[PDB]
Amino acid sequence: HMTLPAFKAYDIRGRVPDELNEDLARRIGVALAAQLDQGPVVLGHDVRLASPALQEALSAGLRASGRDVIDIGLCGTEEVYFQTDYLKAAGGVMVTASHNPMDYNGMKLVREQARPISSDTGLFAIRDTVAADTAAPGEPTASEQSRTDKTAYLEHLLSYVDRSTLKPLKLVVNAGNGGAGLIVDLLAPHLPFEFVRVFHEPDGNFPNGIPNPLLPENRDATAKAVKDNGADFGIAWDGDFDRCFFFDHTGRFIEGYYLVGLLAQAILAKQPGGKVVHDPRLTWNTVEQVEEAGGIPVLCKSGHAFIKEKMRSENAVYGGEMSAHHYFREFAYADSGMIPWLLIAELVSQSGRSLADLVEARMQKFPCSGEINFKVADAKASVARVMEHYASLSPELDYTDGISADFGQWRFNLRSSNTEPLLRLNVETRGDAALLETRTQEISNLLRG
Ligand SMILES: O=P(O)(O)C[C@H]1O[C@H](CO)[C@@H](O)[C@H](O)[C@@H]1F
Ligand SMILES: [Mg+2]
Missing domain, CATH: 3.40.120.10 (Alpha-D-Glucose-1,6-Bisphosphate, subunit A, domain 3)
Known part of the structure; x- marks a missing residue:
């Protein structure tokens, strides 16, 4: 190790205790207080066994640095976003291991209005300060308050639906x-x-x-x-x-791509003329549904930090990524795992249509491969092998996020991940399940070549 491995592009992510531990966490608390504007810091944690001790150590470092701490307790990542913005905090940390193994944990950090703190927006500065901090731990000069009350958060979730139109689904x-x-x-x-x-x-x-x-x-x-x-x-x-x-009611898992266009129709019914942000991996269905609902679609690089800043700059009411991330302007421009299903239950209730029927024709119109990952020996050479093969067909190329290639009746996006050393493929067609399969397999053999 030349840099601390636990500091990734969007968050902190490491095995306990050699990559992440209470001493590193306390140092991260100290370094975070140097990065923020004035005000207190919101702390919450997920259900992992070691997460509370990581939170306490973060609190001690923050409070040794004269930062009031607001302990919102065991919570979801979105509650740290919401409470950071709602209480007008200087920032917030969620202690969460996402779905890394049992010996792993991590943190997601935000500043004012729950704006993300990423490698190029303060996370590596924190990493560097943490790397060189050999100062003795100071003693707390600020206080911790425990704010378990979720009333404002719950009231905010319920404001997205008209509770009198909801049916007993x-x-x-x-x-x-x-x-x-x-x-x-x-x-x-x-x-x-x-x-x-x-x-x-x-x-x-x-x-x-x-x-x-x-x-x-x-x-x-x-x-x-x-x-x-x-x-x-x-x-x-x-x-x-x-x-x-x-x-849906048949047990069929709905591919996240179609939820972006679906949620955008839901939102745009109450917020007419609004803009909707989406990623470049899968696009055609979203662009059409947003436009069909009176909205303006706004293409943005995938990644929660890019989506959020694009949403702010455009005043977009809703942003959606195919990978199960949905962001709402009214929610500090932050993602929520709760708003989406409230909006879907409201849509099923009001329309009288099953969730299956709400997406069925869309999935037939724009079938997609799903995201397929490739660990290859040479990502750049593999990408080149794919582009060389297709060049004679003269596709329209866009480089918003890796390479997007539009051939008319089919398209693909091919990216390197910012969280994993992989190539990620997405293919879609215009109503052609056969073309989708032959092109997906064709590209796969190229990548694996
Ligand atoms: O590995 P990728 O594709 O570089 C990053 C992943 O994590 C990000 C932040 O949570 C998401 O916004 C993103 O859409 C994706 F699921
Ligand atoms: Mg998560």
């Missing part, structure tokens, strides 16, 4: 033993739905596996609950529930 909810079920249970007295709770209790030992609804084994536990109970649809979250995943 039967919804499977799968927290994966993460944190989402505690918010579900607080929302439920204000909602008419019948909840079928699966893997509902928070448990950092994760008896049913680490929360990841994308893994087919975890996917199926929600699907089975929906089919067996005749639920209208199902929702599963990751551990810190800033990501949500939808299953």
